[PDB]
Design a protein around this nucleic acid. Sequence first.
RNA 1: UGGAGAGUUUGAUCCUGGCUCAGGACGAACGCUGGCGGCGUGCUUAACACAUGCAAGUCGAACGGAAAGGUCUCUUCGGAGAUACUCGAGUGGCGAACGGGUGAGUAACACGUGGGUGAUCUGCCCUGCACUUCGGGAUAAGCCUGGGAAACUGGGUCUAAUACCGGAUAGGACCACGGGAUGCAUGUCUUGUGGUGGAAAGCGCUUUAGCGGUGUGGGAUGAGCCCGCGGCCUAUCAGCUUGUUGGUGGGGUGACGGCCUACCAAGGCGACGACGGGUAGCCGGCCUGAGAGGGUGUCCGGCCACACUGGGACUGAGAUACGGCCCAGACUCCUACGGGAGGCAGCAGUGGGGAAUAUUGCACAAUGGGCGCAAGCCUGAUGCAGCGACGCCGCGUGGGGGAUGACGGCCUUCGGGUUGUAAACCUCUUUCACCAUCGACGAAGGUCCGGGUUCUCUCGGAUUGACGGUAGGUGGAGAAGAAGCACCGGCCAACUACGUGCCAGCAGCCGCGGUAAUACGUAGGGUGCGAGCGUUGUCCGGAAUUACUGGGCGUAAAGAGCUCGUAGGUGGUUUGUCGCGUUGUUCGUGAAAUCUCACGGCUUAACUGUGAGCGUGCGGGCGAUACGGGCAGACUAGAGU
Lengths: 82, 91, 200
Amino acid sequence: KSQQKRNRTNERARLRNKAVKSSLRTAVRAFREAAHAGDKAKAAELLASTNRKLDKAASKGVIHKNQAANKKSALAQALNKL
Amino acid sequence: AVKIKLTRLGKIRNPQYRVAVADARTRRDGRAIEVIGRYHPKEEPSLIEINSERAQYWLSVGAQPTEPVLKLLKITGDWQKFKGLPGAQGR
Amino acid sequence: ARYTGPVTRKSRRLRTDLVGGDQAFEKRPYPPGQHGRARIKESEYLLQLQEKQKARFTYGVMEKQFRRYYEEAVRQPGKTGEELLKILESRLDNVIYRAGLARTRRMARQLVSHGHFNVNGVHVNVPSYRVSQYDIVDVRDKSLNTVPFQIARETAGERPIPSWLQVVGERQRVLIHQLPERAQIDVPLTEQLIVEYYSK
RNA sequence: UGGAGAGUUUGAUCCUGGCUCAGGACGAACGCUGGCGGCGUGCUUAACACAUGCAAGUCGAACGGAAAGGUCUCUUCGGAGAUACUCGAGUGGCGAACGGGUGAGUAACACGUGGGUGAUCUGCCCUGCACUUCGGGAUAAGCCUGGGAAACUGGGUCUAAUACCGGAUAGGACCACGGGAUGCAUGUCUUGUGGUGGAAAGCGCUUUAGCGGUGUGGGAUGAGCCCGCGGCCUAUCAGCUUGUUGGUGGGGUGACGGCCUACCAAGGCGACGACGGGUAGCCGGCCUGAGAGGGUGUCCGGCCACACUGGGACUGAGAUACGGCCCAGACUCCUACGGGAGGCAGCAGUGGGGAAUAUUGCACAAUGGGCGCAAGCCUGAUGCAGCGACGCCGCGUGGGGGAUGACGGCCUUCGGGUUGUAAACCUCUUUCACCAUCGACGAAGGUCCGGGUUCUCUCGGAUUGACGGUAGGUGGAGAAGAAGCACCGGCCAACUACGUGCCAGCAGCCGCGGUAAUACGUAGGGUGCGAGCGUUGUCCGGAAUUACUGGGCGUAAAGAGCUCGUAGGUGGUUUGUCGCGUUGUUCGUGAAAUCUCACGGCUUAACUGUGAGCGUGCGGGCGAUACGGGCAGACUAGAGU
Ligand SMILES: [Mg+2]
Ligand SMILES: [Mg+2]
Ligand SMILES: [Mg+2]
Ligand SMILES: [Mg+2]
Ligand SMILES: [Mg+2]
Ligand SMILES: [Mg+2]
Ligand SMILES: [Mg+2]
Ligand SMILES: [Mg+2]
Ligand SMILES: [Mg+2]
Ligand SMILES: [Mg+2]
Ligand SMILES: [Mg+2]
Ligand SMILES: [Mg+2]
Ligand SMILES: [Mg+2]
Ligand SMILES: [Mg+2]
Ligand SMILES: [Mg+2]
Ligand SMILES: [Mg+2]
Ligand SMILES: [Mg+2]
Ligand SMILES: [Mg+2]
Ligand SMILES: [Mg+2]
Ligand SMILES: [Mg+2]
Ligand SMILES: [Mg+2]
Ligand SMILES: [Mg+2]
Ligand SMILES: [Mg+2]
Ligand SMILES: [Mg+2]
Ligand SMILES: [Mg+2]
Ligand SMILES: [Mg+2]
Ligand SMILES: [Mg+2]
Ligand SMILES: [Mg+2]
Ligand SMILES: [Mg+2]
Ligand SMILES: [Mg+2]
Ligand SMILES: [Mg+2]
Ligand SMILES: [Mg+2]
Ligand SMILES: [Mg+2]
Ligand SMILES: [Mg+2]
Ligand SMILES: [Mg+2]
Ligand SMILES: [Mg+2]
Ligand SMILES: [Mg+2]
Ligand SMILES: [Mg+2]
Ligand SMILES: [Mg+2]
Ligand SMILES: [Mg+2]
Ligand SMILES: [Mg+2]
Ligand SMILES: [Mg+2]
Ligand SMILES: [Mg+2]
Ligand SMILES: [Mg+2]
Ligand SMILES: [Mg+2]
Ligand SMILES: [Mg+2]
Ligand SMILES: [Mg+2]
Ligand SMILES: [Mg+2]
Ligand SMILES: [Mg+2]
Ligand SMILES: [Mg+2]
Ligand SMILES: [Mg+2]
Ligand SMILES: [Mg+2]
Ligand SMILES: [Mg+2]
Ligand SMILES: [Mg+2]
Ligand SMILES: [Mg+2]
């Protein structure tokens, strides 16, 4: 059959993508907590770090560029409304 | 990609061919994007006509001919015209 | 297939002689069978049937092929009967018969079958071959000097040559000026009854 | 450019009106019979269960390496040496989502046709512009081990990369503020500033071998989503709906969206048939028909759905993921009883069901496909072959003379008639079969060698075809090897004898057979067709018996018992306008094949190629206003007071 190689590589890729997406999720929830507190001080760079992480994930190919852009816009507007 | 290929549409022992511009992910005798010529390998040498401006259009826009179609384009001079080589007619 | 049977019976049923030649007449009346002397009912279907029979057995065509010839004729522009006659006349063995190279129709058919002719230098051996305008018909050059073909070399005077084909000198060759018009060429039948037969 | 009727209700008639027949067709089956070739075609039933073999790999020009062959090679004289072409296993890239099958489900934007996407994505391919810069930690493989019956799996060391990870710079990412274009409301496109960010990979070289990598602008391609219109039966299914209908803020997606969520409002669909039930893949097409229609969706082509049954996700440019993964279930198998394996609706094939449907064939020679710089390697796609008269087409079983009215058969009014130019006999030619021999086109190609440096070009050389020693050609002897089936009362062409004697039997209808049967069985004769001919089954026709073309309701079937009135349908005379209907023209589209007309090519034809039609339609633009309709008026003849 010799699709066992594909079976193994798919598992490795699944693990890498899962790790990356989980890291982005934690970054986003941290920023959401910062914005909910509304100090406007630490959120000002948590936004930068989170957007940088989203862009890095998009360049790595774990997510799609449009998804990265959507999340970046949503978070930036959330900051602007506070 | 996009290919310029030969589709067999004759009978059981007289392989007539049409020179069709088709996507590679398509069966041999499938719906072609555009037929631009024909090829009959049974006449005096054979019978060959290409549109010679639609062929130029497809070659310029990016279609990759298969190897027999490349042979026909070299015979008819369209491939030499497109690439920029001296002999534009060689039939 | 072919009929390959007594032609005199087949002429006696249809009340018309279709052969001529040495066996032109049987020298007797037309009771085609044991009850052949009966004065029988004459239907409208019978006339059409026997006319199409005459058309088929004048040329030795089979019903399935005559049927196709009918669609060709009715589907051709113009008229219908003359087109049917033209199609039935353009058959190559018929051309051989009409060019004065044959004692009858059957033996002309056999000469065509055994491949004794070339049209455009092409060896043909199908009786139902259709000749065309500007067709030359040539006898196979390695087939001449044979008895049944040279017996027709000197007897080329009695039966008239129609005015659409033409024969030439000792090299017996045929030229077709244009397609015939059988309606003015030797109709022993009315073509208007075949049409009516093929409508029911 | 094309339209045929007949039988049967009566003592007879004319109507009405059913029933039946004469035609065509088939993915067919069965009965009798059977020579050949060409081109097509073959599980319609159990989406039933499947033994066996094959249907997807490739790259050493990404990498560590050295199980195999070949090596210079030492030397064992039976073992050594990755440095070395080459290469099993392995990491990595790409492919595996195409191609192939089946039609179970589905009445639905599934399909067909026309649009929209300012609401979207798109690997490889083309092309413009930029860049290709620093580092780092591992592990597969190997080696040593552990567990297990197996299937597999744990650990320790050990090594790379175009594998992985972190940085620098890089606008089509984001936020805010502005300009310039355009419009179809969201807006879209292009620009300026400020603030945040986002990559890359090297390998090879007989010396201009060559392959590569990343970000972006623009093409091409493919795809997603939304909408108008169109194509079944059923009201003896009349009330359906609560994420339901709409809004706001969030979430989610490649993308708009109740797609999801919290809150708010109380809507939405329905007699133009909602909701429900039955059946079904849809179309180009195929059959029939004068046409309009009716039936149908099989070969071929397009789209959809599915892959033992149900659910789910992952990887990826892209997944119903047939020969991938996870779970549950049924089934088959292995087991040391702890646990494991499998999925022919791929090709061929087996059992079963059935009236019924094929070989466990050959080749990658041609075309298409995947990987590779290439040579190459893979391809049950495909190209062919085998089998079945299953179908369409074509050709044979001889030809020219010859009343012995041979012989005989049969009938006879016993005189003759018929089979019947038919035979005998005379003569002639051998298409196909038979024998021998030569032998292809499909290959202006695929390979290595030479001019050409390469690119491009011939040159010439070998060599390469499964089909195939086939088609075809040539030559040889000989009428030599080759006809059957159905029917004969009318429809409907085709008649007598014998036997039988309401019996045996026939029959589509109405009828035929009870002692002289053209209707039963046989014989002679005849008719039709012919490698076929009949029967059964199904569809159209005839059937103007669902009537749009193209019918009816006094008495033949058919006016509701009568009225009022809702939706609907229809509407008097006249003026102006719009241009929805209508009509003219042009552009786009209506794939190819099939169909029609003309040629062209296979010896003809079937078959095949080309060109023009057709494609009745739909969308865009530009004209016309007679009629219909809308809008704004007028009038009194209809209607009312
Ligand atoms: Mg691999
Ligand atoms: Mg966590
Ligand atoms: Mg958003
Ligand atoms: Mg009565
Ligand atoms: Mg009476
Ligand atoms: Mg009647
Ligand atoms: Mg089936
Ligand atoms: Mg290897
Ligand atoms: Mg590669
Ligand atoms: Mg892939
Ligand atoms: Mg698939
Ligand atoms: Mg189905
Ligand atoms: Mg639509
Ligand atoms: Mg290890
Ligand atoms: Mg940066
Ligand atoms: Mg880097
Ligand atoms: Mg709610
Ligand atoms: Mg909402
Ligand atoms: Mg179904
Ligand atoms: Mg009709
Ligand atoms: Mg399913
Ligand atoms: Mg099954
Ligand atoms: Mg399943
Ligand atoms: Mg990919
Ligand atoms: Mg993914
Ligand atoms: Mg699934
Ligand atoms: Mg399967
Ligand atoms: Mg399978
Ligand atoms: Mg797969
Ligand atoms: Mg099979
Ligand atoms: Mg059976
Ligand atoms: Mg059985
Ligand atoms: Mg091949
Ligand atoms: Mg190939
Ligand atoms: Mg049979
Ligand atoms: Mg009669
Ligand atoms: Mg009797
Ligand atoms: Mg009888
Ligand atoms: Mg035949
Ligand atoms: Mg009927
Ligand atoms: Mg009708
Ligand atoms: Mg009417
Ligand atoms: Mg009536
Ligand atoms: Mg009335
Ligand atoms: Mg009455
Ligand atoms: Mg009545
Ligand atoms: Mg009344
Ligand atoms: Mg009203
Ligand atoms: Mg009204
Ligand atoms: Mg009105
Ligand atoms: Mg009016
Ligand atoms: Mg078409
Ligand atoms: Mg021709
Ligand atoms: Mg228009
Ligand atoms: Mg009045």
